[PDB]
Every structure is written in C-alpha cells, then in structure tokens.
Amino acid sequence: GDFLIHHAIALALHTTTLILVKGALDARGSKLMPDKKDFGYAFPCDGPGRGGTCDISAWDAFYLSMFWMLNTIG
C-alpha cells in the first residue's frame, strides 16, 4: 500500500512540475504566441484566432498547477 501511494505521489510531483516548468519555459514564447513576452505574465488570451488561445499565459500555468499542487498534498 505504501509502494502504490509513493508512485502516485511521484506521479503528482512530476505532473505539477510539468505544468510549472512548461509555464516557465514557454513564458517568453511558444509557437502560438512567439511574442508572448510582449504581453506580460498574466494576460487572458490572444483571442479566438489561430485555433483559440485560452489559458495561454505563463500565469495560467500557475493556475493549472495549483490544482495539481492541491491534489498532491491531498
């Protein structure tokens, strides 16, 4: 039982790290917003064009990793 939960805790540590690292490393730019750094840290989106850009900011990866942080400490 302790083996299984530690691997769940490992899953949640790597997944929270993933969202946060992806937020840090794509903060300056990505392929959707190559100029993402001109808009700041917390901006809503770049609009519905190019397929849709909801939660594209680096702040939004903080937002998404907060759910995974709560899940892991749970």
Partner: protein, 161 residues
Amino acid sequence: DVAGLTPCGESKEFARRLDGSVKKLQTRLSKYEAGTPPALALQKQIDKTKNRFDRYGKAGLLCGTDGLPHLITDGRWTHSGEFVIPGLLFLYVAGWIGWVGRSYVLFARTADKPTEKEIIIDVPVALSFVSTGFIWPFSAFKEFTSGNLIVPADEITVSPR
C-alpha cells in the same frame, strides 16, 4: 524469506484465504439442487478458486502477513518472472507497435495525399509493416546508427526562445 515475507505455500493466512473463499461459495451452493445449472456454475467456481490458490502456493510467490501474494521487483533472478520477464515481454510488443507505426507514418509521407493514408489506411501495406516488427530491436538500432532514426536539431521547428 525476502523482506521478511513468507512463501505462500506455507503461509497460514494464505491458507485461510483459500478456505474462506471456498466457504463463501459453498454456502451459495447450499441453496441449490445437485444437477441444476446454478449448482454446476458454482461447483466450477470452487474448482477454479482451489486451482488458483494451489498454483500460487507452488509458484514461489511470497505472501505477506495479510495472506496475499507480494511481488519482488528489485532485479533478483529468483523473482524475475514477476516483473523482469513480463516486462521484457511487454517491451518487445511495445517496440514492435512503435516500430510498425513509425514505419507506416514514413510510408504515408511519400503518398499522393499523405493525410488520406492516415484516415483511410492502406491495409495491404500496413499489414506489410506489422509483420516486419518481429525484429524491431535490430531494425531500429541499425536505423539509429545509419543516421535515419534521429533527425538533427536544425531540421526541427522550435519556439523562438
């Protein structure tokens, strides 16, 4: 034994697991007449339950204090049939599926309409690829060393940063 565990063939808690599992089925069988279909169904389940417990006891599995089999996965050879060999079996199938899928996506790139080959699969050619997967470790490593698995970093699109 290993990690203070007990072989399932001499675990008393394993023995009580088998008995309780059969008493539970026998009291359901006590409510049916001999030749009925519910009696034969439960008599076949008592045979299956006993067979499983017998096989586990004689297999070299180790039981805990709870009387359930535990798997040793540290790499020791006396326990390689619990993870290392099932894992070797898995990776052979997984690399086969990967090699075969990769071979078809490269074929479809040289097609008249490359995206039509991926929603309408050329089944004779895709079956030609699935048969090739049996020697994927040799085929994929030779693919690697011949400079055809890995593309260089400067032919891959990256984000500006």
